[PDB]
Symmetry: D3
């Protein structure tokens, strides 16, 4: 019988591999994914929201930049509990959505990271408010390649990478949670959000300041983040606010006139 | 102090024993029951909804057919925890509502069936993977409880080995789902809840009446024909649509009157 | 350029000619008709709502009883202005909906009754000052149009001098209201819309069937008994509650499916 | 047929003549007045809202200070068109509400002040261009009507030549706005509505009491001090905030009770 | 990892120490506090609401009467779990709000911030069980108390329930009495009890909470001469509120829309 | 007194001249513009919405492509009526917003294009009857105004006799719609607004760039290629989806920040 109280925040990195797919993928998301979703999890999800990603910045491709959105659920129970596999009504989820997102064409894994509802580490910019200004919120998840010691990767991240973020005045905030791997075997290890004022601030720090970094022995590309795009790193730059707070705001797929 | 996280889906089988009562019972439900309810459980119920039952089909009376609605709560805690008996404001619940629902007559009355379930169906026995796009569903929700002194394991075995296969054989039946009732919560006499989908009333009839004549009449039967259980006492049911506009936590804006 | 301020209340009498059609027609209405509709007229309709009809009462068939609902719009402009025919996105309206409503068979076929009215009742002939606290109302909404070649003044005189007094005499009848149909808008064949309240179905029957036998059968009668008009062609009706949860502009949150 | 497009903003000055009445009057307003109201005018009112008045300031009694709220409707048509008198469902409006508001006593009562205005202020006499970021406003809304047999032109001249300049001189006063009352609608005795903003109650006092002592007492004065008009009869007022949570068409979700 | 399921009802006693502050404090609450709040706790709070207090009644000052509102959260987890201190976006909460509420003087002794955690359901129902909304409009006097330092808690409880409550039960003017014990283990709130005591109106409140209560033995630990015998705003806070608020913030809020 | 019933649809072409400005401009729009706006026009605007533009396509710069959104109001009265200039609270509109949108540099600046239209399209030139089920639309909304000293009738003739036929010839173009700009309202320099649908960006390109090379370059042309008009000055545009979540009158619940 018993079901564990397991409050978590999920993030899904929704890419769009081509502008010709955008109308169709966007349609599916807003016309189909929302109602199918709420139909299933309304009673045990407290917040379902989409954060459309800003235009892909220069060299964003190398950070597995999700060109469509982030998809953010707040769960009261583990959606991977086997008993939750049973649904009266099932979702409409065509093959085509996976083509559009880039799961299918070599093809890219579906990154679904589970987190505790609150950030575990606050490494810069504590006490910042909304009045302090509009944030270019760079959300990035990473997973160290196979056969790399996790403790060693953690040590690299926090002792080599983060200090560069702390040094940069262009970087207003740094936050990190460790991925709940015990839930869905997500290959990612960390999720970070790193705020800037704008795209140029992002570039200056995440490209130029980061050239200073020693290229690690396990690197899957020459430059930071040294991890395989869309496979061992995904990301998105998003705004402080979304109008797509789906549990509160959705009123059907109303069409423009 | 401690309060156990106990996520459940409740169903109440709301009958209406006479069309002359319908205006008044419907009024109570939508004008009074909703605000009184939300006033009490808003902080620990995630979804409160009413699914109006379709017109009672031929021989529906024999399945304890609730002629008004199903009432569906999603709980985060056991509403039968004794500490939850204390309410600043109490509900308005007249005698008359029980007359209307058939709990009391003008000449024997009917129990109030309030079944607690896990939020997710336990058994998916037909039609897995069906979506809303596959078409409009005549959703026959039926709960049953085996008569007193009938072994539960034996009743389970009957249900799943004799009854369900007839549903599986029938092309008219698009879906079959079952959960075992949480009896430990409120001593509900029912044992199972099933939802059995059809295309329409005729599909329902063809299977639940005609195909079911084939069944061996069990020794404990309380009526001659399937479901072999006493209407409204050991079986209640309702046929409902996929969608309700009465999703009360989101949708309610007061008892606004027609012009 | 100029667009006339034309505040009106529309009523559409939505029938359902068979229970096997109900799931599918209900689906279309709530899953498709609503969003397609709001997509088009949100900026110039102040209220869009559906009032599900109560179960068809005995002999309701003879009053063109809409077995599904009433569909009620409040317009700021004439939807029949020719310039309003152009829509970026058009509605999905299958042939099948007309089968289900009885506009076509799959056994003669019934017109689509869409009556335009002023937003306020023109005549208040009984029960003025009645409030919601006075009790739950069985609201019988009925529209009528006199057969071809019948003088309109003469029909009016019949209605108000012969019919209405029987309603006024009956204590079972709590309210009587009437507006004259705007015929100048969409050529609707109906002439009047009335709402006649009772306590319940039996009150309705006692008055609209039994008390009405007393009436002189007029020379133009299209059937033996009141209302003396051809069902679904020259009379449509529905009995509805004071309240609907389907106040679509405020309440709709998508076609969310039961679990 | 034709109904004139008449966009207006109404204000009703809702007093509460005793603290012992506040619970009951407040209940009526929020439990009964809202749903009865929306039930009637939803299709032709674009905004219905209540602005609770701040605590009555010193000597506010002399300005006909409404100790409960302002009631603010935005109309698309004249509610005083005679055809709008007919309502299917009528409102619940007990005698007691009039006692509570002070229309009737337990020993002379007070008129019901219902002022119709154009939706936009006619005169902007101070503080043009002020935004919400400029700070929180103590908004003193005051309506006045000159006693019987006082020339209106002469009263206007007094107001704009003697009164207004004192407001303009006072740095404590951040804003001055005025519309002339639509008298042609409901024969409201009032002539002007003004809103006069301060930072706080003391600012209000300093200007509307102390600075105003400077004023010549006019020959028609109905009291010794400004505003020289009979409280609640020829002057009503209220001090309100920039924001109300009671924007009733958008926000109302029923009379949900505290736990 | 694990986070405990801890369903609770919080109450915050929001005072306003001067009418000249009311516009500004009210603005902050409705323009800023709400969105900043929902931005943080939307996923684990089921109900966030404000109950504006009725006008301070005669001698209400002596009961630590919050002249602005009550602030009522329903939590699914302990907001005082240390891991909940981390927020992406932090709240805007100026010094000035503390001046307005009376936590600080503007340039000199202030008043503590009373934030009481409770179980979601009342623990004791001591009068008026079964009363409905149809029974009439309620003057709901919510009052929290905490016994002075070095007063035995069991002894204070015994005083409250054996001396005070019977006066409430005797008074026909008092329609309801409810009490929960404060969860002290959560945030070290100095208060011990929260009670709600209903009347018909302000005069009913006065007749009972002032006049009937004169009958009471003045305890040895008393911090003022008259009931409630506790230091205003420090060891007792209160508010009289209506059955209904329009500020049910999770459901109702549509932005800080300004009057025209 | 009188206020004319003037139902209209406005469009504002909101550009964003640099990605470094997007966070800040987007913030202003969603945090400030919305509440300031609703605070002013809630009672006489039936729909306020934002349609975020898709990524600027190849050579979109030449069509005055608004890189932020379209801003769409539905008015019941002319916002340019002089009496509507008076507002109690005024809007917060920094210099910086004009920098971000490109009205000013920190080169050469760009006019603020605010086009008023009838609520319904005047000309339906292709794809009549198309529904939402027919598929997802790349909706290219484009407004144009003919250079100074060009006869308007002659420009109209060019548009409908030369340009539109190319759209009609292209199977890649699923829809063509046009309204004439109400110039009598706000002296907007634009003359027409068109919406031209494709399947996707490539369809847009193939037709609006490649097929359009076929066109005779007119004598008044302000650039070599179609649309032959000065970007952002005599032509603005945006490609948008069928649906926006930013339907501000229904959906806005404050500036809630991500966690
Ligand atoms: O319930 C689910 C769901 C849904 O209800 C609606 C919807 O529109 C998409 C969905 O997608 C979820 C999903 C599918 C495949 C995966 O590989 C995965 O990780 C998650 C699925 O579980
Ligand atoms: O919006 C969502 C979403 C999406 O936008 C894109 C995508 O590719 C998959 C998705 O799937 C999400 C989901 C739904 C139900 C579940 O039970 C679940 O685990 C995940 C869904 O809500
Ligand atoms: O909270 C409750 C409640 C309520 O608040 C409002 C309302 O309108 C009806 C209600 O009915 C519930 C109930 C009553 C009698 C029973 O015999 C039973 O099992 C359940 C009760 O629990
Ligand atoms: O709609 C409801 C309902 C109803 O429609 C019919 C009926 O006969 C009883 C009911 O009672 C339900 C209820 C309310 C509060 C509770 O705490 C509870 O356990 C049950 C109520 O919500
Ligand atoms: O706007 C319209 C419309 C719509 O927007 C949505 C929808 O779901 C059905 C609709 O149907 C309307 C209609 C009126 C009269 C008829 O005789 C008929 O076939 C159809 C149509 O005009
Ligand atoms: O619900 C509705 C409805 C319906 O339920 C049944 C039906 O058979 C036709 C309908 O059509 C209505 C309609 C839509 C658009 C219009 O422009 C119009 O005048 C009427 C629609 O709103
Ligand atoms: O319909 C109305 C109405 C209503 O629907 C609801 C309500 O709660 C109060 C109301 O009161 C209005 C009114 C009554 C008496 C007057 O003397 C007056 O000037 C106005 C009336 O118009
Ligand atoms: O809030 C309202 C209100 C009120 O709060 C107090 C009061 O004493 C009268 C009132 O009457 C208002 C009203 C309703 C309908 C009308 O047609 C009308 O003209 C006025 C009502 O809505
Ligand atoms: O002392 C004050 C003050 C100040 O010292 C400096 C300054 O730049 C602006 C100010 O303006 C404040 C204010 C004025 C009018 C209001 O209506 C309001 O809410 C606030 C006031 O507090
Ligand atoms: O001494 C003064 C003064 C005064 O004598 C009386 C009075 O009633 C108000 C006053 O206020 C004046 C003032 C002007 C501008 C401000 O911004 C401000 O705070 C105050 C100031 O000149
Ligand atoms: O008496 C007053 C006064 C004064 O006499 C002298 C002085 O030097 C300043 C003053 O300033 C006060 C004031 C000004 C503007 C406000 O906006 C406000 O609330 C208060 C005013 O009342
Ligand atoms: O800049 C700000 C500020 C500041 O710099 C210093 C300081 O001591 C207080 C402050 O407080 C401002 C504020 C006042 C009242 C409110 O109601 C509000 O939301 C914010 C804030 O903006
Ligand atoms: O998160 C919090 C918060 C917030 O987000 C928004 C807001 O407008 C007020 C707030 O106030 C809370 C608080 C303040 C002072 C205290 O002394 C205290 O105990 C708690 C704080 O925790
Ligand atoms: O309304 C609220 C509020 C208030 O009105 C006044 C005040 O002085 C403090 C407040 O603080 C509340 C709060 C408490 C705990 C939190 O963890 C939080 O985020 C916010 C906030 O919700
Ligand atoms: O009311 C208005 C308004 C507003 O309320 C809020 C807001 O955030 C921006 C605004 O801008 C509008 C506007 C700006 C520039 C123009 O050139 C023009 O014609 C109109 C203005 O009218
Ligand atoms: O969103 C809007 C908007 C905008 O988004 C961007 C922009 O650059 C100007 C704007 O101005 C619009 C406006 C407001 C009030 C009015 O009276 C009016 O005519 C226009 C506003 O609503
Ligand atoms: Cl039998
Ligand atoms: Cl909601
Ligand atoms: Cl016949
Ligand atoms: Cl709404
Ligand atoms: Cl005169
Ligand atoms: Cl060129
Ligand atoms: K060319």
């Amino acid at each position: 019988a018993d079901f564990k109280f397991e409050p978590m925040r999920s993030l899904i990195y929704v890419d769009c591999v081509s502008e010709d797919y955008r109308p169709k993928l966007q349609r599916w998301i807003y016309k189909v994914a929302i109602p199918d979703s709420i139909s299933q999890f309304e009673p045990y999800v407290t917040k379902y929201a989409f954060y459309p990603s800003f235009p892909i910045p220069p060299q964003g491709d190398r950070f597995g930049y999700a060109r469509m959105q982030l998809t953010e659920h707040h769960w009261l129970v583990s959606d991977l509990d086997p008993r939750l596999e049973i649904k009266a009504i099932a979702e409409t989820f065509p093959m085509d959505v996976l083509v559009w997102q880039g799961q299918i064409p070599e093809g890219n894994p579906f990154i679904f990271a589970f987190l505790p509802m609150w950030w575990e580490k606050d490494l810069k910019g504590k006490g910042r408010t909304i009045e302090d200004g509009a944030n270019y919120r760079f959300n990035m998840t990473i997973g160290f390649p196979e056969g790399v010691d996790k403790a060693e990767g953690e040590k690299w991240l926090f002792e080599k990478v983060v200090p560069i973020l702390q040094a940069a005045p262009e970087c207003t905030r740094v936050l990190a949670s460790a991925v709940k791997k015990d839930i869905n075997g997500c290959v990612m290890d960390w999720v970070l959000e790193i705020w800037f004022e704008n795209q140029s601030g992002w570039y200056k720090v995440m490209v130029d300041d980061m050239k200073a970094l020693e290229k690690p022995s396990w690197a899957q590309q020459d430059a930071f983040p040294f991890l395989k795009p869309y496979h061992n790193v995904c990301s998105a730059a998003v705004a402080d606010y979304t109008p797509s707070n789906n549990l509160a705001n959705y009123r059907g797929y109303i069409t423009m006139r």
